[PDB]
Amino acid sequence: GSSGSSGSPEEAVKWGESFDKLLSHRDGLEAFTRFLKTEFSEENIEFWIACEDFKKSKGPQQIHLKAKAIYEKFIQTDAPKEVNLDFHTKEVITNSITQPTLHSFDAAQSRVYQLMEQDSYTRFLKSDIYLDLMSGPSSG
């Protein structure tokens, strides 16, 4: 189907190359998140995203707004989308929530970005959502 075509098996095989590769592409990322959503873990990827976008913020306002939100969202533990972060990273931000910058969150993003790439990614590779992408003529 030239007109309509979604989810290509050619990109999947490549996605495996590296975690980043998968993210780079929308399809790959989306699918990856789905797997987590079912396990109520998406919260992790949710933070990773807000970051990549946070940097694309304009002016101090956007940085402050997004910062406060994302902070009391993932950063903080008493939050719903609270992700697994280092004590310091959580504290430093809590106090530096007023002096946040574009090159500040970057640190936190790295923490999570890895957490997933470690398990999330691997586990995702063996996830139905992923497999389907290729739907190899042989299971196992």
UniProtKB/Swiss-Prot annotation:
It is found in: Cytoplasm. The keyword 4Fe-4S does not apply. GO terms for cellular component: cytoplasm; plasma membrane. The keyword Zinc does not apply. Keywords: Cytoplasm, Phosphoprotein, Signal transduction inhibitor. Residues 18-134 form the RGS domain. GO terms for molecular function: GTPase activator activity; GTPase activity. Its main location: cytoplasm. Expressed in peripheral leukocytes, bone marrow, platelet, spleen and fetal liver. One of its GO terms (biological process) is negative regulation of signal transduction. Inhibits signal transduction by increasing the GTPase activity of G protein alpha subunits thereby driving them into their inactive GDP-bound form. Binds to G(i) alpha-1, G(i) alpha-2, G(i) alpha-3 and G(q) alpha. This is Regulator of G-protein signaling 18. It comes from Homo sapiens. The lineage of its organism: Eukaryota, Metazoa, Chordata, Craniata, Vertebrata.
